[PDB]
Amino acid sequence: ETAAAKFERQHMDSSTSAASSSNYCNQMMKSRNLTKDRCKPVNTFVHESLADVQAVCSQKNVACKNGQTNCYQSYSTMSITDCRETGSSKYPNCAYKTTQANKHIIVACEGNPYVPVHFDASV
């Protein structure tokens, strides 16, 4: 899987404007294969068009949590869904808490075309 493709699979959900219900994370973590060999503990889904996320690579340049400088913060807020494993979750029965919000996203960009390869965080 290419870096750009892995990002898309793990973070893009342009089919919905926002998480429907509390079971959104349980379904999405499963269908995007994030519960295949381990319960990925934390994951953020972005509900905006691929083009709008891609555009962030031309927005505000900031440092990445790791100190690298190829991160960008979106000018505007975006619809996101935070998925976090519950204190009780255990493989293979992965359980998640869903939290919908509108925040600015921060992504790491690379290549050419210069596209998002990692979801750094949101604010």
Ligand X SMILES: *CC(=O)NCCNc1cccc2c(S(=O)(=O)O)cccc12
Binding-site residue numbers for substrate are: 6, 9, 40-44, 65, 84
Report the nearest approach of ligand X to the CB of residue 88 (Å). Answer: 24
For residues 54 and 74, the answer to whether their CB atoms sit within 8 Å is no
For residues 81 and 24, the answer to whether their CB atoms sit within 8 Å is yes
Report the nearest approach of ligand X to the CB of residue 14 (Å). Answer: 16
Catalytic residue chosen out of the listed positions 7, 8, 10, 11: 11
Give the whole-angstrom CA distance, residue 107 versus residue 98. Answer: 21
Q: Which is nearer to ligand X, 88 or 116 (CB)?
A: 116
Residue carrying structure tokens 């381990």: 38
Q: Which is nearer to ligand X, 10 or 35 (CB)?
A: 10
User: Can you say which residues are annotated as belonging to the binding site?
Assistant: 6, 9, 40-44, 65, 84
Interface residues with ligand X (CB under 6 A)? 6-7, 10-11, 66, 108, 117-119
Close Cβ partners of 93 (under 8 Å, ≥ 6 residues apart): none
Catalytic residue chosen out of the listed positions 118, 119, 120, 122: 118
Q: By beta-carbon distance, which residue lies closest to ligand X?
A: 118
Tell me how far CA of residue 6 lies from CA of 11, 33, 62, in angstroms. Answer: 8, 11, 22
Give the whole-angstrom CA distance, residue 114 versus residue 102. Answer: 25
Report the nearest approach of ligand X to the CB of residue 21 (Å). Answer: 23
Task: Examine the residue annotation and report whether 118 is marked as an active-site residue of this protein.
Answer: yes
Task: Examine the residue annotation and report whether 104 is marked as an active-site residue of this protein.
Answer: no
Give me the phi and psi of 27, to 5 degrees please: -70, -45
